[PDB]
Design an enzyme around this catalytic site. Sequence first.
Site, PDB file in Angstrom:
ATOM      1  N   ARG A 223     -42.192 117.062  23.262  1.00  0.00           N
ATOM      2  CA  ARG A 223     -41.552 117.642  24.887  1.00  0.00           C
ATOM      3  C   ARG A 223     -40.305 118.392  24.382  1.00  0.00           C
ATOM      4  O   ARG A 223     -39.836 118.896  25.289  1.00  0.00           O
ATOM      5  CB  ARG A 223     -40.838 116.255  25.173  1.00  0.00           C
ATOM      6  CG  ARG A 223     -39.831 115.813  24.397  1.00  0.00           C
ATOM      7  CD  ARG A 223     -39.008 114.795  25.224  1.00  0.00           C
ATOM      8  NE  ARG A 223     -37.810 113.708  24.075  1.00  0.00           N
ATOM      9  CZ  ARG A 223     -38.972 112.348  23.221  1.00  0.00           C
ATOM     10  NH1 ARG A 223     -40.138 112.536  23.686  1.00  0.00           N
ATOM     11  NH2 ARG A 223     -37.497 112.518  22.624  1.00  0.00           N
ATOM     12  N   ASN A 224     -39.872 118.829  22.970  1.00  0.00           N
ATOM     13  CA  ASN A 224     -38.586 119.336  22.444  1.00  0.00           C
ATOM     14  C   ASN A 224     -39.849 120.548  20.852  1.00  0.00           C
ATOM     15  O   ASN A 224     -39.165 121.280  20.724  1.00  0.00           O
ATOM     16  CB  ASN A 224     -38.097 118.860  21.219  1.00  0.00           C
ATOM     17  CG  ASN A 224     -36.775 117.881  23.138  1.00  0.00           C
ATOM     18  OD1 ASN A 224     -36.230 117.925  23.743  1.00  0.00           O
ATOM     19  ND2 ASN A 224     -36.601 116.622  22.401  1.00  0.00           N
TER      20      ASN A 224
ATOM     21  N   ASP B 210     -33.867 123.251  21.079  1.00  0.00           N
ATOM     22  CA  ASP B 210     -32.785 121.920  21.673  1.00  0.00           C
ATOM     23  C   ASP B 210     -32.373 121.639  20.239  1.00  0.00           C
ATOM     24  O   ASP B 210     -31.610 120.600  20.298  1.00  0.00           O
ATOM     25  CB  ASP B 210     -33.203 121.552  22.538  1.00  0.00           C
ATOM     26  CG  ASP B 210     -33.572 122.777  23.974  1.00  0.00           C
ATOM     27  OD1 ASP B 210     -32.209 123.125  24.103  1.00  0.00           O
ATOM     28  OD2 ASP B 210     -33.579 121.667  24.596  1.00  0.00           O
TER      29      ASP B 210
ATOM     30  N   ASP C 134     -33.551 115.382  17.835  1.00  0.00           N
ATOM     31  CA  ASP C 134     -34.900 114.800  18.597  1.00  0.00           C
ATOM     32  C   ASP C 134     -36.047 115.649  18.888  1.00  0.00           C
ATOM     33  O   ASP C 134     -36.074 116.314  19.779  1.00  0.00           O
ATOM     34  CB  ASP C 134     -33.783 114.464  19.993  1.00  0.00           C
ATOM     35  CG  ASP C 134     -34.564 114.014  21.426  1.00  0.00           C
ATOM     36  OD1 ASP C 134     -35.761 113.029  20.565  1.00  0.00           O
ATOM     37  OD2 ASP C 134     -34.186 114.220  22.546  1.00  0.00           O
TER      38      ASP C 134
HETATM   39  C1  LIG Z   1     -35.804 123.059  28.014  1.00  0.00           C
HETATM   40  C2  LIG Z   1     -36.113 122.820  29.420  1.00  0.00           C
HETATM   41  C3  LIG Z   1     -35.508 121.187  29.895  1.00  0.00           C
HETATM   42  N1  LIG Z   1     -35.363 120.971  28.753  1.00  0.00           N
HETATM   43  C4  LIG Z   1     -34.185 120.906  28.506  1.00  0.00           C
HETATM   44  O1  LIG Z   1     -32.517 121.474  28.520  1.00  0.00           O
HETATM   45  C5  LIG Z   1     -33.049 120.077  27.610  1.00  0.00           C
HETATM   46  C6  LIG Z   1     -33.608 118.557  25.833  1.00  0.00           C
HETATM   47  C7  LIG Z   1     -32.927 118.444  25.515  1.00  0.00           C
HETATM   48  C8  LIG Z   1     -31.717 118.451  26.331  1.00  0.00           C
HETATM   49  S1  LIG Z   1     -31.171 119.733  27.205  1.00  0.00           S
HETATM   50  C9  LIG Z   1     -30.511 117.751  24.796  1.00  0.00           C
HETATM   51  C10 LIG Z   1     -30.864 117.034  23.803  1.00  0.00           C
HETATM   52  C11 LIG Z   1     -32.068 117.411  23.426  1.00  0.00           C
HETATM   53  C12 LIG Z   1     -33.308 117.237  24.435  1.00  0.00           C
HETATM   54  C13 LIG Z   1     -35.725 121.337  30.871  1.00  0.00           C
HETATM   55  C14 LIG Z   1     -36.516 122.203  31.394  1.00  0.00           C
HETATM   56  C15 LIG Z   1     -36.901 123.636  31.231  1.00  0.00           C
HETATM   57  C16 LIG Z   1     -36.802 123.365  29.799  1.00  0.00           C
HETATM   58  C17 LIG Z   1     -37.214 125.053  29.524  1.00  0.00           C
HETATM   59  C18 LIG Z   1     -36.404 125.940  28.679  1.00  0.00           C
HETATM   60  N2  LIG Z   1     -37.414 127.391  28.265  1.00  0.00           N
HETATM   61  C19 LIG Z   1     -36.012 128.039  26.866  1.00  0.00           C
HETATM   62  C20 LIG Z   1     -38.625 127.383  28.539  1.00  0.00           C
HETATM   63  O2  LIG Z   1     -38.626 128.654  28.206  1.00  0.00           O
HETATM   64  C21 LIG Z   1     -38.651 126.720  29.482  1.00  0.00           C
HETATM   65  N3  LIG Z   1     -40.159 126.951  30.205  1.00  0.00           N
HETATM   66  C22 LIG Z   1     -41.081 126.480  30.998  1.00  0.00           C
HETATM   67  C23 LIG Z   1     -41.135 125.694  31.592  1.00  0.00           C
HETATM   68  C24 LIG Z   1     -41.245 125.506  33.102  1.00  0.00           C
HETATM   69  C25 LIG Z   1     -43.059 126.172  33.361  1.00  0.00           C
HETATM   70  C26 LIG Z   1     -43.486 125.774  34.258  1.00  0.00           C
HETATM   71  C27 LIG Z   1     -42.670 125.585  35.749  1.00  0.00           C
HETATM   72  O3  LIG Z   1     -41.618 126.631  36.034  1.00  0.00           O
HETATM   73  N4  LIG Z   1     -41.952 124.584  36.170  1.00  0.00           N
HETATM   74  C28 LIG Z   1     -41.972 124.580  37.657  1.00  0.00           C
HETATM   75  C29 LIG Z   1     -42.632 122.882  35.849  1.00  0.00           C
HETATM   76  C30 LIG Z   1     -44.247 123.506  35.443  1.00  0.00           C
HETATM   77  N5  LIG Z   1     -43.929 124.273  34.127  1.00  0.00           N
HETATM   78  C31 LIG Z   1     -44.942 124.737  33.173  1.00  0.00           C
HETATM   79  C32 LIG Z   1     -42.224 126.871  32.676  1.00  0.00           C
HETATM   80  C33 LIG Z   1     -41.999 127.336  31.185  1.00  0.00           C
HETATM   81  N6  LIG Z   1     -38.186 125.474  29.937  1.00  0.00           N
END
Ligand SMILES: Cc1c(NC(=O)c2cc3c(s2)CCCC3)cccc1-c1cn(C)c(=O)c(Nc2ccc([C@@H]3C(=O)N(C)CCN3C)cc2)n1
Length: 263
Positions: free
Chosen positions: A130-131, A144, A126
Amino acid sequence: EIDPKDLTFLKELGTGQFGVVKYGKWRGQYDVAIKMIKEGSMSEDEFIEEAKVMMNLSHEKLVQLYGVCTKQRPIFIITEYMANGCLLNYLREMRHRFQTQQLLEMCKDVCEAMEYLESKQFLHRDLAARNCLVNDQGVVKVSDFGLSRYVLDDEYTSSVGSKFPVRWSPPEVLMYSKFSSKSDIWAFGVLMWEIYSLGKMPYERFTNSETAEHIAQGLRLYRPHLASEKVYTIMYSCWHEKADERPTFKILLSNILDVMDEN
Ligand SMILES: Cc1c(NC(=O)c2cc3c(s2)CCCC3)cccc1-c1cn(C)c(=O)c(Nc2ccc([C@@H]3C(=O)N(C)CCN3C)cc2)n1
């Protein structure tokens, strides 16, 4: 197996395919993301049985899977933290700031990760902007990898489901569910397109089925404005109808490096 006592939850990061993801620390020091696996969302027994290879995948350009907490419900997956979030949103938010050199560097980052996965015969399945995630220094890493295999959600696992990554899939995946190194290659081409279009949706205004129909008949994504002919040639090579005519990630990395040297 990480001791959940060693984890401090700090912030909600949103929701993904397995439910809630949180930012925290491991042992008061290391930044981590913690997926709390929603009950019924994952083939847990299967993941746990098969998860060791995935944890042993170690590369600078992979978002590392640090460990798991399985002695509890819900189970946790602990990964490296990436302060700038997913690449698709990062492209969209900083759209007017990027130089073309930086876009190429992003492609190189992903290609290095994928070349490593390819060398370990491990499929992402995938791959898409987005990933991919972005750290505090703008380094892109692939996230992922391999997890799509454990998803329990008909809308995602069926090629006619609304969550299936149709727009990142070659014909043999859409017709036969035939995943291989070469389906990751196709997806990487679409990812390069996401990068050079600064985060546009591929085949926007086409439905998933229309996308399937049209790629099956040879329709390909256009050259984004910021992509040079050499760059477009690289992404286009990923989209050969026949899988065996597609390059390897080793070859793509060499192609990307050669462009960098000329520039
Ligand atoms: C990877 C991920 C997901 N996605 C998944 O877990 C999956 C994707 C897939 C799965 S599970 C199985 C099938 C294949 C596809 C969802 C939310 C956050 C993160 C995530 C992970 N990691 C490892 C991060 O470091 C990270 N960082 C991050 C996220 C959001 C923000 C920040 C925020 O805090 N908010 C609330 C929204 C705005 N954003 C910039 C900053 C860093 N997000």
